[PDB]
Amino acid sequence: DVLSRMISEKAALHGLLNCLIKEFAIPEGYLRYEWPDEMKGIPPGAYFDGADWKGIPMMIGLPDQLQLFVMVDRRDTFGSQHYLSDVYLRQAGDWQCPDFEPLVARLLAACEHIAGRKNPELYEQILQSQRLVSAIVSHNGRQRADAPLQHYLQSEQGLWFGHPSHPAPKARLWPAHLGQEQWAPEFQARAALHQFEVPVDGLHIGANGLTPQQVLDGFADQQPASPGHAIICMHPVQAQLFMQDARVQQLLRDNVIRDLGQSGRVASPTASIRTWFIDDHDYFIKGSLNVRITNCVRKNAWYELESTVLIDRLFRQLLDQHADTLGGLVAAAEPGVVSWSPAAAGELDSHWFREQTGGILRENFCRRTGAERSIMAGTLFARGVDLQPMIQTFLRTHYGEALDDNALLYWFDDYQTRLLRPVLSLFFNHGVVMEPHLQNSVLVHQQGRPQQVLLRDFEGVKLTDDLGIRYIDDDIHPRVRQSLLYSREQGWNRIMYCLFINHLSETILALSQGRPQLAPLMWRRVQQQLRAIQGELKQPSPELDALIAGHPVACKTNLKVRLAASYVRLPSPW
Numbered sequence: 001d002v003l004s005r006m007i008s009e010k011a012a013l014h015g016l017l018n019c020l021i022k023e024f025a026i027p028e029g030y031l032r033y034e035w036p037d038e039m040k041g042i043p044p045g046a047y048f049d050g051a052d053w054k055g056i057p058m059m060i061g062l063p064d065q066l067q068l069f070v071m072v073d074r075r076d077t078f079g080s081q082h083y084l085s086d087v088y089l090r091q092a093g094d095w096q097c098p099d100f101e102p103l104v105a106r107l108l109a110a111c112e113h114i115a116g117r118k119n120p121e122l123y124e125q126i127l128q129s130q131r132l133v134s135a136i137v138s139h140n141g142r143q144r145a146d147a148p149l150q151h152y153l154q155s156e157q158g159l160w161f162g163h164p165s166h167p168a169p170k171a172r173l174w175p176a177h178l179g180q181e182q183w184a185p186e187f188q189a190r191a192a193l194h195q196f197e198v199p200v201d202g203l204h205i206g207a208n209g210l211t212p213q214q215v216l217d218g219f220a221d222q223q224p225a226s227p228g229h230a231i232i233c234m235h236p237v238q239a240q241l242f243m244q245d246a247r248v249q250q251l252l253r254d255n256v257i258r259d260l261g262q263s264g265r266v267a268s269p270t271a272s273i274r275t276w277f278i279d280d281h282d283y284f285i286k287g288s289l290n291v292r293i294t295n296c297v298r299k300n301a302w303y304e305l306e307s308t309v310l311i312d313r314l315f316r317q318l319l320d321q322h323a324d325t326l327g328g329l330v331a332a333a334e335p336g337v338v339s340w341s342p343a344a345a346g347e348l349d350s351h352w353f354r355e356q357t358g359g360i361l362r363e364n365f366c367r368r369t370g371a372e373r374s375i376m377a378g379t380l381f382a383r384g385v386d387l388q389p390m391i392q393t394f395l396r397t398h399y400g401e402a403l404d405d406n407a408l409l410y411w412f413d414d415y416q417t418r419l420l421r422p423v424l425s426l427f428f429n430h431g432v433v434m435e436p437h438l439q440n441s442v443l444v445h446q447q448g449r450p451q452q453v454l455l456r457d458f459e460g461v462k463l464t465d466d467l468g469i470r471y472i473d474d475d476i477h478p479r480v481r482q483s484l485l486y487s488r489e490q491g492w493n494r495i496m497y498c499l500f501i502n503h504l505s506e507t508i509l510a511l512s513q514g515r516p517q518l519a520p521l522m523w524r525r526v527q528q529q530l531r532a533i534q535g536e537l538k539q540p541s542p543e544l545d546a547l548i549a550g551h552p553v554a555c556k557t558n559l560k561v562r563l564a565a566s567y568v569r570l571p572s573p574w
């Protein structure tokens, strides 16, 4: 419990170092792998461990007379390293090791001068995200370290620390008056979804291979509705919000719509917070929620609600027909979509409604892929309750004995074939831009042995203006078309940050913990894959050649955005 607090700070602190490094120090060149002149204030124990140094000295010149020292376990062009000491800072001066709060005060404080822009909210958010993490750790701190990985839902609920490179991972600014512990996957949160009785004339249903009626069936047991009516459901938090609107009030006071209880299915919220998982239900429920959670506000905007539909119909046309050109793609359907809005409301309203009431079903792929056989990547490669990459002990148990270097490179290599081949085939063959970061990705495994890397999330999916866009069957609202349209370098920036800096960087960092020498080998294995896959592509790919030949990699900046998205340029690992 004090231990708990201290684990949460080390995670939240390392998370923040990751932003600082990747988003400022490496791109703006404030980083040096060198010992300081004076060590006064840094205790031997911080950098010497009896035998040898605790790794490599890392130094940042934060351009305001402030200096930062930290022992890292490796040199890394992406910033992906393990921090093997506390953090120390200077002025004059003498090195010091301030508590977590003043340590955040101060790092942040410097980040602001480097970015010219300040965010007082972000600060209070950082401590919030950290405080939750304590509670989280504290609640789960007695479990087998790797239990998260044993089971799909549990891996959706063992992402104890959130975004590895994010200043406020667990911060969820909804009305504090609605709690926090009861809407957290990480507290094993469960809840019967909030429902509403609405008349069938306002329904907007998008289905693919599914009857309008079957979509409804998916979201809510349609029975309790009187005829001419239907049952939508929402996040219970969304439900309070959505009921705040003068508009809805009116609707309620006029019995145009009935507010049923939290009376829907009992589901568990997923790591994405507003998606819900019912075991052996054919679908997840991906509802909206007007709350900032990490970056954005998790509404399905009205146009996004149309586009899921098209993307699904797209992904099937392709999977059905263009198999070979997809490098092995496995994707979760988003086959059905529902929203409601008063029959006669005029579109500033109609829209507003459909985005409050928006719902999207995702195929519960655990049915195709087996509960105990599929693990959410972000968790696959996360640090468990002891700040130890869970992947290690998971594999050690699946492969009987401890795994030598070459086992680990093999493993890594089966993995990354199956993440790279589909993402990149999708991009260059079709202009379909995916968002394959750690959370948008689920590993399917035959007892350790990677089978598929399932991808999902059509919100994230965009289409390139020269290519991807062409699968758009043109009678599409100009606003919808606008949400899908990525410029091809806009788009390649995403694919780059996602596969490389968010996903594999981290996959690597997880496996090579304790064995940094594995890092560079792994990336070299990456680079061959890059070339072999290219050899296979059926369209040109200059940006790929660029990358293979070691040109710099795009990296989305989480912290800088919140302070002043912006992508910065990080040196290739090769």
Ligand SMILES: Nc1ncnc2c1ncn2[C@@H]1O[C@H](CO)[C@@H](O)[C@H]1O
Pocket: 159, 162, 163, 164, 169, 271, 272, 273, 293, 294, 378, 437, 438, 439, 502
């Ligand atoms: N490594 C990650 N990258 C992107 N999103 C993540 C990551 N880990 C967790 N998430 C969660 O996934 C959602 C982003 O789609 C957010 O709710 C975010 O908090």
